[PDB]
């Protein structure tokens, strides 16, 4: 078929450099405005740069002088050389081919994650969240798990090793002190807990750590 095969992204420190790339599959760049776009952490879609027929090259102001877009029209591979990387450059990057005649983008590469941070691999601290006194009552009770201070993303969290899948809400991670923090809640009938056990299981592949925390009154 017709597609764009993207390269792996990566983690880099501020001021560092990194190169992304996409190989055409089923077509040639000849005639297209090959470009790069990015979805920011705030969820805004931004155009980054484009290169048309070798010389029509354009850049977003914020990246002029730091990012260089280039193309190997012989091998049909698009490149984005990122240098002087800043924290604000953290985002999901996508390469896409722009029709030079209608100016739309039909073929897109899968998103490539780029993270700019000074943080070093750090395993999370997993804290159990037990209900306050007088709230363990009611027809149902809610327990929680706080996963704090880890890097980089992601972590995988389950309750009772997956047996407890319903009534769970695991929230998106947020940054604080350059490290990620996430939380998860699980709601069960007051009958179950505490008599029965409820455990929070957190895996963080980056640090090869697997932590289990039982929620006790």
């Amino acid at each position: 078929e017709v597609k764009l095969v993207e390269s792996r992204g990566g983690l880099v420190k501020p001021g560092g450099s990194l190169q992304l790339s996409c190989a055409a599959s089923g077509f040639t760049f000849s005639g297209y405005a090959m470009s790069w776009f990015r979805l920011t952490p705030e969820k805004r879609l931004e155009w980054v740069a484009s290169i048309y027929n070798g010389f029509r090259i354009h850049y977003l102001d914020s990246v002029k002088g730091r990012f260089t877009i280039s193309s190997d029209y012989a091998r049909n591979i698009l490149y984005l050389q990122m240098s002087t990387l800043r924290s604000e450059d953290t985002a999901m990057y996508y390469c896409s081919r722009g029709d030079a005649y209608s100016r739309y983008f039909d073929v897109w590469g899968a998103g490539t994650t780029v993270t700019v941070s000074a943080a070093k691999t750090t395993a999370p601290s997993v804290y159990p969240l037990a209900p306050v006194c007088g709230d363990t009552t009611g027809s149902s009770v809610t327990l929680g798990c706080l996963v704090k201070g880890y890097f980089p993303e992601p972590v995988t969290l389950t309750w009772n090793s997956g047996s407890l899948s319903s009534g769970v809400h695991t929230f998106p991670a947020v940054l604080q002190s350059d490290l990620y923090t996430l939380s998860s809640s699980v709601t069960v009938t007051s009958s179950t807990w505490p008599s029965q056990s409820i455990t929070c299981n957190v895996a963080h592949p980056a640090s090869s750590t697997k932590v289990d925390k039982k929620i006790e009154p």
Partner: protein, 220 residues
Amino acid sequence: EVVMTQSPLSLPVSLGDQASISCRSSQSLVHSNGNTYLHWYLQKPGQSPKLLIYKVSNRFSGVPDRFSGSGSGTDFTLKISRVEAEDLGVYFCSQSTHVPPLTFGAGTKLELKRADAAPTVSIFPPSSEQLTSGGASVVCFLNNFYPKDINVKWKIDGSERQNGVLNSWTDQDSKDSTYSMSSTLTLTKDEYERHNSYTCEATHKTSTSPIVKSFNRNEC
């Protein structure tokens, strides 16, 4: 730079309903060559953007006829004749008339409607383990509510507390169409042991007054 403004930011609909999304530019998108380079894209979670309509009203190959575009100059509209589950996601308009730079609207999230639901609020004190490390995070969950709009307020010993609060929101639940929120107030162990009354209050359209949950530290 041309600014693209989309309205609404969130569009709740019921499956089978008609949907209409607006996009307006700060300047006419009519190029000097006579063309209007205004386009519509749809992006779903964990997926790349997909082209739906180009040059205002040209439906791209493979795109269902349920989608249609219109408008001119500074105002444009994307319409969906009959919304299907597969259509849920974020719709972006983009202009490529005045470039560089190409610019996009902030997007319109197409979501599902359901009956109103008050949030179930639960508060949690710092754990023994975290306190041993010198930290003290108080957590409050505001779960399964609808509509998505909600506000949380923290109070320490009765006074509003804005510093040290971090929030997180889930996407609309794929099973019950509700939303949930997590709010965490982080203090140092020192500060936590300096006060006693901790409170989280939720303001939602399902109640005139906020839903309050609280606890006293010295009680645990």
